């Protein structure tokens, strides 16, 4: 009902060495 | 099939209308 | 009112009331009732309003545009003069449009006013309408939405080349 | 381009001939935009250090606006000077070479033939 | 399990705590004055005075003038026997065509 | 003023209108100089528009 | 819904009725101007080329 | 134009120095005062445009889009204030600041005397709209739309930038007033063909074009209500305004370069209207309706007759008002049922009779009921395209069947039939919502009385 935000699943896509 | 043909058409029309890619500095 | 030359109305011919039957028509009684109940109070209120118009008489004026040089005698790419030429040409374009509208109003009023004999009795208005539509079409048709005095001059020059070639090929 | 011009008297921010040009007014809209950049700088300075943005350091915001207007005034003087030098060199080069800029004959549209393309 | 999360807030009803709510705000005085501002500066100001402004525009794009001017020019050229409109917009004497 | 915030936009209008008049004097190079509205000045008058 | 429609009609009529009464008083007492030829030497103002008084007011004040 | 830009900028200290319960009231009041001020632009002339300065001007094309733009801000502040109630105060002021900045960009986008200032303001309008859509869009799932925005930047605005710099070098100016008198015919060559595509494809995506409309039933769905209102009402019409400015320079090559894209629109409005008959999402249905109506504006600009420009600018103003009201009706149900599914909440005339009256009026303006200016624009475009080709009336009239068909279907599904049983949070209509519907509809109905102010520079 509220606004979507990044979960852990979305946030872990930008934590590695390369994209 | 698309981008190679469009690029070759651009090179053909650069031959025709005289399009310079490494253009000499004039001004 | 208006000007009876630009809006011509031929002289009205009404027939006299010729009562043949003894039964009184309702229309004369309703006309007298309309003349008493409706025409008189409206006319009195209009006279009051017209007295109040007379208590402050002030005027307005029809704006005049003196003729500036047209696009033919303006230099190429000289915007100070061809701007004036374009403003003159656009004012003449809108005025030519209203001339065509006046001739259309004449033709429609002639058709209704003549009724069933409209084809016989409105030949002159139809002739004037054909001439003014031919003139307006030769002057302003097919210019496009980005019309200008240059487009109109080029259309006039192409038409004059066609007329000169048609004159030459006839001899 | 103009680097041979400011090579006879190098490292002059404003030369002497720049004093023959009208300086910008203090109500120059360019200089007013530079003062607004100073006010924005003061607000960002209070924002990044968690101060009240519109309240804290009014002397500091005043020095931000003052310092940006002060630097921008001389920057606008040099800007106006360099465009004046560009036009001076342009006009003196056109005057010193009349053969390269011929007075091309002005034809009115009564002689100019343009092709009419009808929209139909 | 998954992370520490605040739960989904339920949709509030503005009619419960204020049955005279116009929906502008939950504070009733703010709500009623928001209603008065929207209705006055929307309807009493922009629509009414705006339609009054547009209705009495001083000859928007000189249409009426252009009719009355036409009522001059037709009267000038009905009387002098001229045609009502020439087929050429400009004078054909001041035009130089390309020869062939 | 207790209602000093309701004059931000309206004075911001008038000042804006002020600057519009301020730009009109910078565009008066053809005031009474066009070929359409050139005329002699009436008595007690210095410009045709401001 | 009825509260909205009452408020809609009220806030429309709030300046509708003074505007209609004022336009009526202008058309009755101040009244419609008359067409006239431009005199010799009299150059009219730009707002003096229009007929209705509210149009003259708009062309004089704002335009 | 500086009597409009400066009050729009003074809405920034008005929105940041206002008390926390007063920031909607103050911005709504002063933006309504700016919208009342916006009628001074009606000083238009039958020959000359209203030319303020070296930087700003206004003919009768830009003037109604300016009035609609300055009118759209109070309506967006009304529409977007409910679902920002639990928002932070500073984030709420950031939302209002992005709306004000978008209006500030638009009102000097439409008045741009010179075309590269038009380009700067034109591509400046995307950034506050982007931030409004992606910070307050309530869900963001844009895996396919990133590549499409890359396609918009590649095929669109950058060739327009290179083309405008080329005209700046060739003509010596990009002042539209100078380009009225220094325009050269653009003849048939391959250089001029890529010149035409560079001058047109940015505005083709902004309309949008059929086949290029892939962004619009996504960006309308993933947006807040103010973002969808400004996308439907104004931000599509930048493409039509830019086409009507840039087709001055593209003659006479337009007379044979329009033929593909005209087909893309004449068939395209047959498809997208038909697409509206199979929409589960109501907001997507209104998006595809916006595509189906801007296809006619694309055709009317490309055929460049007077009747087509008059119909196209009347259709732009009318569709701005109408589709903005349709998105506001879609939100006035979404704020209750919390889902955009059009088959979820049915039979709403049993529950909300006045709101169903607003649905009926917005549907009748959507399907071009005369004498509304939707029909005036629709009709004049249809007349001009009949003058273009006498067969196109079929593709017009068939569209004018399907445009009716989804307009009442949207009325019949949402408002008629049996009410949904398991939905019991259907509140009565707030006075804010009905005021929003009336401030859409009543200007749209009053413009039927005097349509001559929305028929463009060649009325
Ligand atoms: C002015 C413009 C620049 C202002 C920067 C600072 C703004 C700020 O701090 O605002 C807060 C402040 C009020 O806040 P506060 O209560 O003091 O405390 C803040 C809280 O702590 C904040 O609460 P919080 O931090 O705890 O939590 C909320 C959170 C919420 O944060 C979020 O939700 C994250 C962000 C959400 C997404 C992004 C939203 C949009 C922001 C970016 C802007 C993009 C569009 C810009 C254009 C396109 C380019 C990208 O963070 C904030 O809100 C942070 C505060 C700052 C917000 C605003 C920042 C604006 C900077 C960017 C714009 C300017 C630079 C780029 C311009 C480009 C070209 C135009 O507001 C102002 O100060 C606004 C100005 C009001 C007065 C105007 C007076 C005008 C006077 C004119 C005459 C004077 C000059 C004369 C010149 C001539 C002299 C001779
Ligand atoms: C009324 C209040 C209602 C409630 C208030 C709220 C109203 C709504 C709020 C509106 C807010 C403003 C919005 C913007 C509009 C502004 C006004 C405007 O632009 O007006 C335009 C337009 C132009 O007027 P103008 O430019 O001011 O003046 C023109 C003249 O050049 C110059 O004018 P003039 O000097 O030639 O005329 C002066 C006129 C004053 O000027 C006006 O009245 C004009 C201002 C009125 C505007 C009203 C607009 C509001 C909406 C009206 C329509 C809806 C009303 C509600 C529903 C009604 C039922 C449906 O003087 C009079 O009226 C006095 C004569 C009265 C005659 C009747 C009585 C005579 C006998 C009396 C006997 C008793 C006394 C005897 C003893 C006497 C002793 C001395 O005015 C009108 O349209 C007036 C309305 C009436 C038009 C004719 C109505 C009948 C037409 C029938 C055929 C066509 C339709 C066929 C339909 C077929 C079926 C579908
Ligand atoms: C500048 C001054 C001008 C003065 C004159 C006014 C000019 C037009 C202004 C706007 C007209 C519409 C206003 C009402 C509709 C919106 C609100 C609404 O739904 O109210 C329902 C409500 C009555 O219903 P209710 O039972 O109480 O509650 C709702 C029900 O629960 C549930 O509702 P329902 O289902 O039971 O009933 C809804 C029903 C449903 O009926 C329909 O859907 C049938 C309509 C379509 C077929 C019939 C019309 C076809 C076209 C022919 C007529 C037009 C040309 C005539 C000319 C001669 C021939 C060419 O709609 C109506 O009865 C509305 C009547 C008017 C309809 C106009 C056409 C709408 C169709 C779409 C556009 C068509 C082309 C554009 C037309 C433009 C006209 C100027 O009305 C009110 O409470 C009235 C509120 C105040 C209205 C003020 C109007 C003026 C606003 C402008 C302010 C600024 C100027 C100052 C003038 C002030 C004058 C007082
Ligand atoms: C414009 C671009 C942006 C678009 C969005 C705008 C939003 C902001 C809104 C700002 C304010 C509104 C601006 C537009 C205003 C348009 C209206 C307007 O000014 O009109 C001028 C028109 C002008 O008419 P006119 O053209 O004849 O004017 C003649 C000129 N004067 C007045 C100087 C002599 O006003 C009227 O027509 C008023 C006439 C009297 C009232 C109407 C009487 C009849 C009404 C219908 C009766 C019932 C019929 C049957 C119904 C059956 C059921 C359906
Ligand atoms: C949209 C799809 C097409 C975009 C093309 C790229 C922008 C071109 C902008 C206009 C430039 C121009 O003046 O073109 C004429 C010029 C003509 O060269 P010119 O103008 O320097 O030549 C002198 C003048 N004539 C022609 C008389 C000799 O075109 C070009 O130089 C090349 C144009 C095509 C560009 C190819 C690279 C991009 C390919 C598409 C990417 C998307
Ligand atoms: C901030 C500004 C601070 C300026 C300090 C003084 C700088 C100065 O006077 O520099 C001299 C220089 C002009 O000297 P000149 O030799 O003509 O430069 C050729 C450069 N290619 O003038 C300049 O280089 C002026 C421009 C300096 C801009 C620096 C910040 C950007
Ligand atoms: C995909 C997304 C959804 C759809 C959006 C639109 C995408 C495509 C946009 C371009 C549409 C097609 C191109 C425009 C067609 C205009 C007429 C034309 O070019 O006809 C084909 C041409 C005929 O030859 P002719 O026109 O005489 O060429 C000499 C020109 N002086 O034929 C030829 O010359 C032969 C072919 C040569 C290659 C042309 C490549 C350039 C055009 C496409 C880019």
Question: In sequence order, what DSSP letters do the residues of D28-46 get, joined into one string?
Answer: -HHHHHHHHHHHHHHHHHH
d(CA H75, CA H229): 9
Ligand in nearest proximity to the CA of H10? 1
**Which chain E residues touch A1 with a CB distance below 8 Å?**
8-9, 11
CA-based max dimension of chain C: 83
Residue H118, min C-alpha distance to chain B (Å): 27
C58 in contact with G at a CB cutoff of 8 Å? Answer: yes
How far is C-alpha E76 from the chain's CA centre? 38
d(CA D24, CA D34): 13
Asked if C146 lies within 8 A of H304 by C-beta distance, the reply is yes
**Which chain H residues touch F28 with a CB distance below 8 Å?**
none
If one residue of D54, D67, D70 were mutated to test the ligand 1 pocket, choosing by the most ligand atoms within 8 A of its CB, it would be D54
Distances, alpha carbon H85 to alpha carbons E25, E26, H161, H338, in Å: 8, 9, 41, 16
Asked if C158 lies within 8 A of D116 by C-beta distance, the reply is yes
Catalogue the long-range contacts made by H25-30 (C-beta closer than 8 Å, 24 or more residues apart): H25/E30, H25/E33, H25/E34, H25/E37, H26/F5, H26/F6, H27/H74, H27/H77, H27/H96, H27/H100, H28/E34, H28/E37, H28/E38, H28/E41, H28/H74, H28/H77, H28/H78, H29/E37, H29/E41, H29/F6, H30/F6, H30/F8, H30/F9, H30/F10
D32 in contact with H at a CB cutoff of 8 Å? Answer: no
Q: Looking up tokens 């006279």, which residue turns up? A: C47
Residue D115, min C-alpha distance to chain E (Å): 12
Write out residues 20-59 of G within 8 Å (CB-CB) of C. 28-38, 44, 48-51, 56
Q: Is F19 within 8 Å of H52 (Cβ atoms)?
A: no
- Start-to-end Cα distance in chain E: 93
Distances, alpha carbon H333 to alpha carbons C167, H85, H330, H412, H426, in Å: 73, 17, 5, 15, 8
CA-based max dimension of chain E: 100
d(CA H330, CA H193): 42
**Residue of the CA atom closest to atom 31 of ligand 2:** G32
D91 CB-near residues (< 8 Å, 6+ apart): none
- 3-class DSSP state of H50: strand
- 3-class DSSP state of H56: strand
d(CA G10, CA G16): 9
Method used to obtain the model: cryo-EM
DSSP classification of residue F41: P
- Measured in degrees and rounded to the nearest 5, phi and psi for residue D10 equal -80, 165
Q: Is the peptide bond between H382 and the residue preceding it cis, with omega within 30 degrees of 0? A: no
Is D83 contained in some domain?
Answer: yes
Q: Is the peptide bond between H441 and the residue preceding it cis, with omega within 30 degrees of 0? A: no
**Which chain A residues touch E8 with a CB distance below 8 Å?**
1-2
Number of structural domains, chain F? 1
DSSP classification of residue C59: E
d(CA H451, CA H438): 19
Burial letters for E29-56: b for 16+ Cβ neighbours within 10 Å, e otherwise?
ebbbbbbbbbbbbbbbbbbbebbbbbeb
Asked if H47 lies within 8 A of E62 by C-beta distance, the reply is yes
D37 CB-near residues (< 8 Å, 6+ apart): D68
Burial class of residue H4 (count of CB atoms within 10 Å of its CB; 0-12, 13-18, 19+): buried
Burial class of residue D112 (count of CB atoms within 10 Å of its CB; 0-12, 13-18, 19+): middle
Q: Is H47 within 8 Å of H62 (Cβ atoms)?
A: no
**Which chain C residues touch F35 with a CB distance below 8 Å?**
68-69, 81, 84
d(CA H127, CA H102): 8
Instruction: Select the residue from G25, G26, G30, G31 to test the C interface by mutation, using most C Cβ atoms within 10 A.
Output: G31
Q: After which residues is chain B broken (C to N over 2.5 A)?
A: none
Q: Which two tokens stand for residue E100?
A: 């062939």
Query: Partners for E (CB, 8 Å, 3+ pairs)?
Result: A, C, D, G, H
The number of beta carbons lying within 10 Å of the beta carbon of residue E71 is 19
Number of structural domains, chain D? 1
If one residue of H74, H449, H455 were mutated to test the ligand 4 pocket, choosing by the most ligand atoms within 8 A of its CB, it would be H449
Report the sign of the C-alpha dihedral through residues G9, G12, G17, G23, in that order: negative
The DSSP bridge pattern shows strands H57-58 and H50-51 to be antiparallel
Residue H139, min C-alpha distance to chain A (Å): 5
Query: Partners for B (CB, 8 Å, 3+ pairs)?
Result: H
Q: What is the CB-side half-sphere exposure of residue C83 using CA atoms within 13 A?
A: 11
B19 CA → ligand 7 middle, Å: 19
H372 CB-near residues (< 8 Å, 6+ apart): H318, H364, H365, H444, H445, H448
In chain H, where the domains are located: 1-459
Q: Looking up tokens 């080349």, which residue turns up? A: C161
Nearest residue to C61 via CA among F41, F47, E69: E69
CA Rg value for chain B: 11
H131 lines ligand 1 (CB under 6 A): yes
Query: Partners for H (CB, 8 Å, 3+ pairs)?
Result: A, B, C, D, E, F, G
Is D104 contained in some domain?
Answer: no
d(CA D1, CA C12): 86
Bridge partner residues of H186 (DSSP):
H252
The DSSP bridge pattern shows strands C59-61 and H57-58 to be unpaired
d(CA H219, CA H221): 5
CB pairs C-G closer than 8 Å: 40
Q: What length does chain F have?
A: 50
d(CA D7, CA E36): 70
Is D106 contained in some domain?
Answer: no
Q: Which two tokens stand for residue F46?
A: 């210095």
Q: Is H300 within 8 Å of H381 (Cβ atoms)?
A: yes
d(CA H293, CA H428): 32
D49: containing domain: 1-97
d(CA H327, CA H323): 6
d(CA C106, CA C114): 12
**Residue of the CA atom closest to atom 34 of ligand 7:** H190
d(CA H145, CA H158): 18
Distances, alpha carbon C89 to alpha carbons D84, E61, E81, H126, in Å: 40, 15, 24, 40
D80 CB-near residues (< 8 Å, 6+ apart): D21, D22, D24
**Which chain A residues touch E6 with a CB distance below 8 Å?**
none
The number of beta carbons lying within 10 Å of the beta carbon of residue H220 is 23
d(CA H374, CA H404): 13
Inspect the structure and tell me whether chains E and G have 3 or more CB pairs less than 8 Å apart. Answer: yes
Write out residues 58-87 of E within 8 Å (CB-CB) of C. 62-63, 65-75, 78-79, 83-87
What is the resolution of the experimental data for this entry, in Å?
2.8
Q: Which residues of A touch H (CB under 8 A)?
A: 1-4
CA Rg value for chain C: 26
Residue C98, min C-alpha distance to chain E (Å): 5
d(CA H111, CA H109): 6
Is D13 contained in some domain?
Answer: yes
The DSSP bridge pattern shows strands G34-36 and H57-58 to be unpaired
Q: What 3 state SS string does H266-304 have? A: HCHHHHHHHHHCCCCEHHHHHHHHHHHHHHHHHHHHHHC
Nearest residue to E86 via CA among H35, C161, C156: C156
Report the sign of the C-alpha dihedral through residues H25, H27, H28, H29, in that order: positive
Asked if C60 lies within 8 A of G30 by C-beta distance, the reply is no
Bridge partner residues of H50 (DSSP):
H58
**Residue of the CA atom closest to atom 12 of ligand 1:** D53
d(CA C140, CA C128): 18
Asked if H137 lies within 8 A of A3 by C-beta distance, the reply is yes
d(CA H283, CA G36): 58
Is D26 contained in some domain?
Answer: yes
If one residue of D8, D13, D73, D77 were mutated to test the ligand 6 pocket, choosing by the most ligand atoms within 8 A of its CB, it would be D13
Q: Is H7 within 8 Å of F13 (Cβ atoms)?
A: yes
- Phi-psi label, residue E91: left if phi above 0, alpha if psi -120 to 50, beta otherwise: beta
Nearest residue to H360 via CA among H310, H416, H278: H416
- Phi-psi label, residue H318: left if phi above 0, alpha if psi -120 to 50, beta otherwise: alpha
Nearest residue to G4 via CA among H411, H145, H428: H428
């Amino acid at each position: 009902a509220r606004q979507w935000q990044p979960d852990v699943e979305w946030a872990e896509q930008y934590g590695g060495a390369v994209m | 099939c698309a981008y190679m043909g469009l690029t070759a058409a651009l090179v053909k029309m650069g031959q025709l209308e005289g399009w310079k890619v490494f253009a000499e500095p004039k001004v | 009112s208006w000007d009876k030359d630009v809006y011509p109305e031929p002289p009205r011919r009404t027939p006299a009331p010729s009562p043949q039957t003894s039964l009184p028509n309702p229309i004369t009684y309703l006309t007298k009732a309309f003349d008493l109940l409706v025409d008189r109070p409206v006319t009195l209120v209009r006279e009051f309003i017209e007295r109040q118009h007379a208590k402050n008489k002030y005027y307005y004026y029809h704006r005049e545009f003196r003729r500036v040089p047209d696009i033919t005698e303006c230099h190429e790419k000289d915007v100070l003069c061809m701007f004036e030429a374009e403003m003159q040409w656009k004012r003449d374009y809108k005025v030519d449009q209203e001339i065509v509208n006046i001739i259309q109003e004449r033709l429609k009023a002639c058709q209704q006013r003549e009724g069933e004999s409209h084809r016989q009795n409105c030949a002159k208005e139809l002739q004037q309408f054909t001439q003014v539509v031919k003139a307006y079409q030769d002057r302003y048709h097919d210019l496009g939405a980005h019309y200008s005095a240059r487009k109109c001059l080029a259309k006039q020059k192409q038409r004059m080349l066609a007329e000169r070639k048609a004159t030459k090929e006839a001899a | 381009m103009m680097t041979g011009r400011q090579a006879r008297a190098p490292l002059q921010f404003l030369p002497d001939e720049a004093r023959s040009l009208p300086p910008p007014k203090l109500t120059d809209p360019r200089l007013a935009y530079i003062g607004f950049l100073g006010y924005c700088s003061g607000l960002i300075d209070n924002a990044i250090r968690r101060r009240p943005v519109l309240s804290a350091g009014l002397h500091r915001q005043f020095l931000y606006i003052t310092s940006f207007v002060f630097v921008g005034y001389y920057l606008l003087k040099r800007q106006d000077y360099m465009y004046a030098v560009r036009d001076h060199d342009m006009f003196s080069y056109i005057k010193s070479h009349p053969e390269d800029f011929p007075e091309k004959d002005k034809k009115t549209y009564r002689e100019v033939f343009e092709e009419f393309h009808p929209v139909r | 399990l998954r992370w520490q999360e605040d739960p989904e807030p339920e949709d509030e009803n503005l009619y419960e705590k204020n049955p005279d709510s116009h929906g502008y705000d939950k504070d009733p005085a703010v709500d009623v004055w928001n209603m008065r501002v929207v209705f006055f500066f929307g309807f009493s100001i922009v629509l009414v005075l705006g339609s009054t402004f547009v209705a009495y525009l001083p000859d928007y794009r000189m249409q009426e003038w252009a009719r009355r001017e036409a009522e001059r020019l037709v009267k000038y050229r009905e009387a002098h026997g001229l045609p009502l409109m020439e087929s050429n917009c400009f004078d054909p004497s001041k035009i130089q065509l390309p020869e062939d | 003023r207790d209602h000093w915030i309701h004059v931000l936009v309206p004075v911001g209008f008038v000042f804006g209108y002020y600057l519009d008049r301020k730009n009109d004097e910078k565009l008066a190079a053809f005031r009474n100089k066009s070929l359409l509205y050139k005329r002699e000045l009436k008595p007690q008058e210095e410009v045709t528009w401001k | 819904d009825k509260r909205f429609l009452k408020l809609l009609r009220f806030y429309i009529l709030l300046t509708g009725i003074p505007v209609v009464i004022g336009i009526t008083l202008i058309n009755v007492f101040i009244g419609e101007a008359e067409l006239a030829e431009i005199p010799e030497g009299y150059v009219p103002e730009h707002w003096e080329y229009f007929k209705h008084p509210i149009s003259r007011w708009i062309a004089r004040t704002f335009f | 134009m500086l009597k409009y830009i400066i009050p729009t900028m003074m809405l920034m200290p008005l929105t940041w120095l206002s008390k926390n319960s007063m920031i909607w009231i103050n911005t709504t009041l002063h933006s309504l005062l700016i919208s009342l001020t916006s009628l001074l632009l009606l000083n238009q002339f039958g020959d000359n445009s209203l030319n303020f300065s070296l930087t700003f001007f206004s003919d009768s094309l830009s003037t109604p889009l300016l009035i609609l733009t300055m009118w759209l801000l109070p309506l967006m502040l009304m529409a977007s204030q409910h679902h920002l109630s639990k928002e932070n105060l500073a984030r709420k002021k950031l939302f209002i600041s992005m709306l004000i900045l978008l209006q500030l960009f638009l009102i000097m986008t439409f008045t741009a005397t010179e075309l590269i200032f038009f380009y700067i303001m034109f591509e400046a309008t995307l950034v506050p709209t982007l931030i409004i859509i992606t910070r307050w869009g309530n869900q963001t799932e844009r895996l396919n739309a990133g590549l499409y925005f890359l396609f918009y930047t590649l095929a669109g605005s950058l060739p327009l930038l290179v083309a405008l710099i080329y005209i700046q070098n060739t003509m010596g100016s990009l002042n539209f007033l100078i380009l009225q008198y220094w325009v050269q015919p653009m003849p048939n060559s391959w250089s001029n063909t890529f010149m035409w595509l560079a001058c047109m494809m940015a505005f083709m995506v902004k309309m949008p074009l059929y086949g290029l409309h892939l962004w619009l039933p996504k960006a309308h769905v993933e947006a807040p209500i103010a973002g969808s209102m400004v996308l439907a009402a104004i931000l599509l019409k930048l493409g039509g305004y830019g086409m009507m400015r840039i087709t001055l320079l593209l003659n006479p090559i337009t007379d044979f370069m329009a033929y593909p894209f005209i087909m893309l629109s004449l068939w395209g409005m047959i498809m997208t209207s038909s697409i509206c008959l199979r929409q589960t999402d109501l907001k997507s249905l209104i998006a595809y309706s916006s595509v189906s109506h801007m296809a006619l504006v694309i055709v009317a600009i490309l055929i460049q007759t007077p009747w087509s420009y008059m119909g196209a600018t009347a259709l732009m103003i009318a569709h701005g008002l109408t589709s903005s009201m349709l998105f506001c009706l879609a939100n006035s149900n979404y704020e209750r049922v919390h889902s955009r599914t059009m088959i979820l909440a049915r039979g709403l005339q049993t529950l909300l009779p006045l709101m169903a009256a607003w649905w009926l009026l917005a549907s009748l303006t959507n399907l071009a009921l005369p004498p509304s200016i939707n029909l005036i624009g629709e009709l004049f475009v249809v007349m001009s395209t009949f003058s273009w080709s006498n067969i196109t009336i079929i593709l017009m009239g068939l569209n004018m069947v399907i445009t009716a068909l989804y307009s009442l279907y949207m009325l019949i599904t949402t408002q008629r039939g049996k009410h949904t049983h398991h939905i019991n949070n259907i509140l009565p209509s707030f006075t804010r919502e009905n005021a929003l519907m009336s401030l859409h509809m009543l200007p749209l109905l009053l413009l039927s009385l005097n349509p001559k102010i929305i028929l463009g520079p060649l009325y």
